[PDB]
Symmetry: D2
Subunit: 169 residues, 4 copies
């Protein structure tokens, strides 16, 4: 997680968020530097859960070529705020996951923040239904992040090159 001064911001989340349309495969396009993702080519796959919420399967390609994956569960603890989820990953304490913006069919912007006294730790990802996302969309989503304090100059661009990411089966 990206540790910075100041308490967590509280950005607005996707109005009328429909988890049913959010399921499926999302490709990581840009992200803040964090501790969890040590590689490239990252995807998140969200699938139906027989309980509440949905289930999570994230995969990425490490620099050595190994595919690393993690499973988790996603739950909206307050059903009146379906876009404010809590993610429970194997071997991890709970972390928030807020869908800030999505059209379900092309892009989403997701954000997570944990307070650390007078500082905070945040995740943030622009994701796409395809390995790429149009630059106009990326710029708009960067606009949203800057509005609530995210230094978009620290954003990392995720490698989704078809050849490099062919290790992703």
């Amino acid at each position: 997680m990206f540790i910075k001064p100041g308490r967590c911001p509280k950005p607005a989340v996707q109005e009328d968020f429909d988890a049913a349309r959010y399921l499926g495969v999302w490709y990581d396009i840009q992200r803040l530097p964090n501790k969890a993702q040590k590689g490239e080519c990252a995807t998140a796959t969200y699938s139906l859960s027989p309980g509440v919420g949905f289930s999570v399967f994230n995969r990425e390609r490490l620099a050595n070529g190994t595919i690393k994956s993690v499973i988790g569960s996603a739950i909206a603890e307050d059903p009146c705020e379906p876009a404010k989820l809590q993610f429970f990953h194997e071997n991890a304490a709970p972390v928030p996951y807020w869908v800030l913006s999505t059209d379900y069919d092309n892009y989403a912007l997701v954000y997570s923040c944990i307070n650390l006294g007078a500082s905070h730790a945040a995740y943030a990802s622009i994701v796409s239904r395809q390995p790429t996302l149009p630059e106009e969309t990326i710029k708009k989503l960067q606009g949203t992040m800057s509005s609530f304090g995210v230094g978009v100059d620290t954003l990392l661009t995720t490698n989704q090159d078809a050849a490099y990411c062919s290790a992703m089966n």
Copy 2:
């Protein structure tokens, strides 16, 4: 839940709790009065989840023969305390679910408490792998409950009569 004086107790939980062995069908035998269950013949079915934790399917037989069911997800938010679960039901805020005692194949004692200032609200249930449980076991588990202040005078016996509950299957 109904309200009793005092903050929540912190009873001991099942040592080395094994959620895989806890899965399957459990019959409600006795419980504290609460608002959630308005019927009889109650069962809880716990099943594999593709994410973390396990999935929840509770069923009961309402008085006009309807079978009311609720879905949920169960997660141990601290993996080092696997008997202290959080249950997320559709249309409910999160609630604790602590497995205080179980031999997995016959009985379990489950406890849930939420603080209300200087008072608290609790659920507590004796459950069985069969629609009945031996009086000796019931009495021992009531002893456990009384050791952290649960008045056994308040426990309701659930109707598990075979004829009455036949529509459950």
Copy 3:
């Protein structure tokens, strides 16, 4: 607190809440039935704290003339939401305290809610800088309460009779 169906509502809180102006003495005028206050003539006194937040001293007149008092501390855990406080009373778990509406010099409407699964427990109080409050103000504040589902049928009127409450001073 006593239990009502539904999860907690999230009513709007006093904009630009100024805790310095909120300090001093407040008289209980009307409130939801609860377990905490068993007496009449109730007042809350809020005072400067050398740390953060402010200090709490509640007093009431018990039926056998005893003046029961409780001490506490009030803290706005998120400084950006100063009207959403947490109250820490001696011998109580933390409880929310939301200033929904106040003009500081005449009236305030305070609300506290804790989720109990699909149900909730709430406190709600109309308070005044005087032992009485005009009927017009009381009626407006009941309107606010009814807008987030508080049944005004349930509100108790607090005894603030001057003769009866004389031992308060």
Copy 4:
């Protein structure tokens, strides 16, 4: 805060913790690297609160000679665990504060940890009633920290030199 892999540990805390004997001045002797303390000569002063808990006044000498201070409130949210406090500092989100070990008259060992998914952020301090602490005591307290995972090789020694710290009025 010191950000490291793994979830927070849960060390044992001081049995029978008596906040009344913990009040007064404590000198920082050794600490984990963190973001809050940017200087040396640090002291914490704990004083009586008219509410619950106690009030907090921390001071340190920056490298430029300026004295920097912060005020806060300390509260045991669960009165049955008086050694597990929550500290509310001005401009800061709440952070835990656990008194692991103290004899009140000479030393204390304090610990704070916040989970960050599969990682965590921790504070830890050895403090003394005097600007120094005997090496035998320091080694014992380092022994306690290593037992629950704290790499005592990362500990910083706080400058409490009488000349350098004379800026502390």
